[PDB]
Amino acid sequence: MVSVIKEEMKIKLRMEGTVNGHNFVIEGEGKGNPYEGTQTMDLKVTEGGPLPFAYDILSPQFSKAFIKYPADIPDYFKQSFPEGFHWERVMTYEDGGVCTATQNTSLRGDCFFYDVRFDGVNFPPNGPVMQKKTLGWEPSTEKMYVRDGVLKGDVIKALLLEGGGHYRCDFKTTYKAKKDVRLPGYHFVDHRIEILKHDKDYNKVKQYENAVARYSMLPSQAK
Amino acid sequence: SVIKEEMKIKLRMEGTVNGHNFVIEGEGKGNPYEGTQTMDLKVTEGGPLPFAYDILSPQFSKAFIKYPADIPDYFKQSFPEGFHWERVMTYEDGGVCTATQNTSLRGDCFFYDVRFDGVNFPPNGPVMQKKTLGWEPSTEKMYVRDGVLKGDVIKALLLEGGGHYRCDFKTTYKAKKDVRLPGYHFVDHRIEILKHDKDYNKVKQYENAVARYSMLPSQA
Amino acid sequence: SVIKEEMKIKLRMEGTVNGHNFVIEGEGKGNPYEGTQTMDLKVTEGGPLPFAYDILSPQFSKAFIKYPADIPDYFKQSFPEGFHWERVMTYEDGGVCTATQNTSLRGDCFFYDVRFDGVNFPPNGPVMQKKTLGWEPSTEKMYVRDGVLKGDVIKALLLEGGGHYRCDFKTTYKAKKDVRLPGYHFVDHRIEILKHDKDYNKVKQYENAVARYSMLPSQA
Amino acid sequence: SVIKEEMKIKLRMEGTVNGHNFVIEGEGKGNPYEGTQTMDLKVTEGGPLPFAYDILSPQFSKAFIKYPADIPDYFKQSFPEGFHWERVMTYEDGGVCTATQNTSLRGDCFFYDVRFDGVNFPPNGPVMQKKTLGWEPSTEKMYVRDGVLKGDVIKALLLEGGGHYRCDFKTTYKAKKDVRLPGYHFVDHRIEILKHDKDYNKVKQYENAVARYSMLPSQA
Ligand SMILES: [Ca+2]
Ligand SMILES: [Ca+2]
């Protein structure tokens, strides 16, 4: 327990972005259990819908305070409050599409406020993103390590495709606390992001993420 | 033809680099058929920029390439409707920038609206430490893919400490109407800062750009 | 069936890193169904190696992954015919390695033949200066593509002085016969050096590898 | 000088692509100060090659670049001792090739020893399906890094049926003795297949290479 982060917390989100020159805005509202690593958010496309690209490319941009951290791994995100943190992200898809995102996370009362900027370029016109042939993300494990006094997270994620097969994306994120925090050693955050409900064009989406931090499953054999 | 031999330019860029928001406005003039242009840039919000201005200069003009008669001019043909472009810029130390640009035309003036975003620049790298000294001249490689025009180019910034800092550009240019598509070709560029104040709040920038095929004849 | 509870391994690697040619011979043994193995490696040509031995250790064994019954085991299913694999390793400072490996089976012994090549390592980087302190444990992501099995993983080497040195692994595993293909899954790995002489001409290394689905339950 | 107006070439390459081993021997001759050369290549083991021969042609000669007097010639200066080079070749569909080359000189003949390795080529991509129609001409960008010479270039294979297939080349050239280092410059290349037999077991190829600065004058 950190007194400023309660056992149940609310979320409010705004995203502005551009994908292949198409502008859009998304608003979100959610709530979760930060120490349980679970959360649900309801997302609504408010400008630019129906999105001409796969909703899936956005869903990982929608919450690092909701990771279940064991007591022995320092929690970069929960320690950063009340000041909060921002993050910066590159997503390199294997067919030349590239997305950047910058996010600000602040805290007021029992509510987290997320402001996201998202930009995607060079998606092929007949590729799975602009043809909306994706079917959600496989579960993944982000690798968290310190670089220049801030926290990096890297993971190769994969979208399931219509017809089978996968579509890969290299995530490189830098997380930057707005005050000094105890820094963790190298570790893993398992993630599983799921779409619980969507309308036909994904104008209205309920999504859920479960995230848990850990060291490796395998024992050390160090001599 | 709706493009005169001398045209004005108006530009607005908004963006975020390393989490820092900024706005730049620009006015310029150029000779579209000569391949040359000059533009005056003012940082109107978020100044002084905490990162090297150089990462922005190549985002500030495709109608001002000198195209020979035997290479279709994808950009000039697109008017009056215009075109937009999309770009990823991958720096060798992990900094990555994206940019999206819309080009429209009214009267004797092109209007440029640019969104620019940079992430993951190392804090002691040359961009965040402002150690850059302008771009080398370069040669963009231009080729059609899926009915639009791509341009890829190896670029390099000169460094205060010596050596170069490398950036790979991959751009997609998308005309807003059907045009005569060009074959594979090259555009030589040289972007130069003519004048800047100490903090690069005000910058006078120049570019020369010329399309061509290879300088080397074919053997048979 | 052809794969017993204990199996021997014989290995030959021929390679060039930074223009330096070398040969490594290895003999090992392990328990394929338990996901464990030990190997003794000797640099027989080109030692002492002028680069970090760590870049080699992940090149030294896919039959030794503990596979649960509900995930098809691509590697064990491929025998007696065996499989080969192809790998690119992209280091964050510009070093790139490739490797091609053939895995065959004769009696109770696996035979590994590996070609390894490393190019463009910076002369003052951690690989050429031997500043690495082993790999962090990792999780390979395995997924089918074009009828064969790919594995992707971002790995990290620990560095003298603190911090990590990242490497993007992209492997394609290709069975020499038709097998049941698995769905998307994970293989946890931990590679450890048990013993080494001063210049790493002689190394005993150990690996534990276990395949699994996600740790997290699904809510759909 | 040790480098005459006409020089012979002898070459051997050993390689593995998509798990397929091969050996190629070559002999050629050229005019180092004119920037031109011709080579006859023969697949001596592993023919017929199951992949596009085009991926090999750029691995077959930097002493044959026409250098003007005001750019130091990194390669010619290195003789009689010579140089070696290292290269990564990242194709847009995930194929990656590495190569390491040693260049020596005896009498009036250059001796080239090449290792080549290609991995992760998609089985229905243009390389494994032999759908390529040679390289577009290109401009390699030369610059000093860590006391040696780097060359980076955007290259593109023309494809049967139209379109291009891109490959990024990153090379490090390493003289075996210290030489006068050049400033940032450009080497235009045009590499062409003049003649081949049915299975590309025998190939005659030609290259023209000329070093220069930018075409465009400085305004600043
Ligand atoms: Ca790098
Ligand atoms: Ca690709």
Q: Residue A194: its chain C contacts at CB < 8 A? A: 218-220
| Touching chains, D (3+ CB pairs < 8 A) | B, C
Q: Residue C213: its chain A contacts at CB < 8 A? A: 139
**Closest B-chain CA to A98:** B88
Q: Residue C147: its chain D contacts at CB < 8 A? A: 123
Residue B147 Cα to ligand 2 midpoint, Å, equals 19
Q: Residue A221: its chain C contacts at CB < 8 A? A: 190, 192, 194, 206, 208
**Closest C-chain CA to A159:** C184
**Closest D-chain CA to C118:** D98
Length of chain D in residues, anyone?
A: 220
- Could C194 and A221 be called an inter-chain contact, meaning their C-beta atoms sit closer than 8 Å? yes
Q: How far apart are CA C152 and CA A37, in angstroms?
A: 26
Q: For residue C109, what is the enclosing H or E element? A: strand C109-119
- Could C141 and A143 be called an inter-chain contact, meaning their C-beta atoms sit closer than 8 Å? no
Length of chain C in residues, anyone?
A: 220
Structure tokens at C22: 């070398």
- Could C186 and A154 be called an inter-chain contact, meaning their C-beta atoms sit closer than 8 Å? no
Burial D172-200, CB ≥16 within 10 A → b, else e: bbbbeeebeebebbbbbbbbbbeeeeeeb
C124 — contact with chain A (CB < 8 Å)? no
- Could A21 and B84 be called an inter-chain contact, meaning their C-beta atoms sit closer than 8 Å? yes
Residue D64: closest CA among D25, D23, D9: D9
Residue B167: closest CA among B118, B109, B217: B118
Residue D153 Cα to ligand 1 midpoint, Å, equals 17
Give this entry's resolution in angstroms. 1.8
Q: How far apart are CA B102 and CA B81, in angstroms?
A: 11
- Residue numbers of D between 15 and 34 with CB closer than 8 Å to C: 16, 18-19
- Could D115 and C16 be called an inter-chain contact, meaning their C-beta atoms sit closer than 8 Å? yes
Residue D45 Cα to ligand 1 midpoint, Å, equals 37
Q: How many CA atoms lie within 13 A of B81 on its CB side?
A: 10
Q: How far apart are CA C192 and CA A214, in angstroms?
A: 20
**Closest A-chain CA to C136:** A186
B61 contacts B82 by C-beta, under 8 angstroms: no
Query: Considering the domain A9-214 in this protein, what is its CATH number?
Result: 2.40.155.10
SS3 state at C55? helix
Q: How far apart are CA B4 and CA B26, in angstroms?
A: 20
Q: Residue B136: its chain D contacts at CB < 8 A? A: 141, 143, 184, 214
- Could A122 and B86 be called an inter-chain contact, meaning their C-beta atoms sit closer than 8 Å? yes
B156–chain D nearest CA distance, Å: 9
| Touching chains, C (3+ CB pairs < 8 A) | A, D
- Could A221 and C190 be called an inter-chain contact, meaning their C-beta atoms sit closer than 8 Å? yes
- Residue numbers of B between 183 and 202 with CB closer than 8 Å to D: 184, 186, 188-190, 192-194
Interface test with A, best of B21, B81, B117 (most A CBs within 10 A): B117
Q: How far apart are CA D48 and CA D71, in angstroms?
A: 42
The phi, psi pair for B16, rounded to 5°, reads -145, 125
- Could B216 and D210 be called an inter-chain contact, meaning their C-beta atoms sit closer than 8 Å? yes
Structure tokens at B48: 């002084």
D217–chain C nearest CA distance, Å: 32
Bridge partners (DSSP) listed for residue A85: A105, A177
Q: Residue B216: its chain D contacts at CB < 8 A? A: 137, 188-190, 208, 210
A196–chain B nearest CA distance, Å: 31
The phi, psi pair for D196, rounded to 5°, reads -155, 160
Q: How many CA atoms lie within 13 A of A186 on its CB side?
A: 19
D142–chain C nearest CA distance, Å: 15
Map chain A to HEC letters: CECCECCCEEEEEEEEEEECCEEEEEEEEEEEEHHHCEEEEEEEEEECCCCCCCHHHCHHHCCCCCCECCCCCCCHHHHCCCCCEEEEEEEEECCCCEEEEEEEEEEECCEEEEEEEEEEECCCCCCCCCCCCEEEECCEEEEEEEECCEEEEEEEEEEEECCCCEEEEEEEEEEEECCCCCCCCCEEEEEEEEEEEECCCCCEEEEEEEEEEECCCCCCCCC
Q: Where are the alpha helices (DSSP H) in D8-112?
A: 74-77
Residue C94 Cα to ligand 1 midpoint, Å, equals 6
Length of chain A in residues, anyone?
A: 223
A57 contacts A91 by C-beta, under 8 angstroms: yes
Residue D74 contacts by C-beta under 8 Å, 6 or more apart in sequence? Answer: D62, D83, D142, D149, D173, D175, D179, D181, D182
Q: How far apart are CA B27 and CA B39, in angstroms?
A: 6
CA distances from B43 to B8, B53, B102, C184 (A): 20, 10, 20, 49
**Closest B-chain CA to A118:** B117
Residue B78: closest CA among B12, B32, B138, B35: B32
Count of A–C CB contacts within 8 Å? Answer: 96
Residue B90 Cα to ligand 1 midpoint, Å, equals 9
- Could B18 and A172 be called an inter-chain contact, meaning their C-beta atoms sit closer than 8 Å? no
Query: Which CATH superfamily is B7-212 part of?
Result: Green fluorescent protein (2.40.155.10)
**Ligand lying closest to the C-alpha of residue C93:** 1
**Closest A-chain CA to B21:** A102
Q: Residue B117: its chain A contacts at CB < 8 A? A: 100, 102, 117, 119
Q: Please provide the DSSP assignment of chain B as one string.
A: ----SSEEEEEEEEEEETTEEEEEEEEEEEETTTTEEEEEEEEEESPSPSS-GGGTGGG--GGG-B--TTS--HHHHTTTT-EEEEEEEEETTS-EEEEEEEEEEETTEEEEEEEEEEE---TTSTTTTT-EEEEPPEEEEEEEETTEEEEEEEEEEEETTSSEEEEEEEEEEEESS------SEEEEEEEEEEEE-TTSSEEEEEEEEEEE--SSPPP-
Structure tokens at C36: 């464990």
Long-range contacts, D84-87 (Cβ 8 Å, 24+): D84/C19, D84/D174, D84/D176, D85/D171, D85/D172, D85/D173, D85/D174, D86/C18, D86/C19, D86/C119, D86/C120, D86/D171, D86/D172, D86/D174, D87/C119, D87/C120, D87/D59, D87/D169, D87/D170, D87/D171, D87/D172
Q: How far apart are CA A103 and CA A118, in angstroms?
A: 9
Q: Residue C208: its chain A contacts at CB < 8 A? A: 218-219, 221
**Closest D-chain CA to B148:** D163
A171 contacts A139 by C-beta, under 8 angstroms: no
Domain spans of chain A, in order of start: 9-214
Residue D19 Cα to ligand 1 midpoint, Å, equals 28
C151 contacts C87 by C-beta, under 8 angstroms: no
User: Pick from B87, B119, B123: which is nearest to A90 by CB?
Assistant: B119
SS3 state at C63? helix
How determined? X-ray
SS3 state at D91? strand
Q: Hey, what amino acid is at A142?
A: E
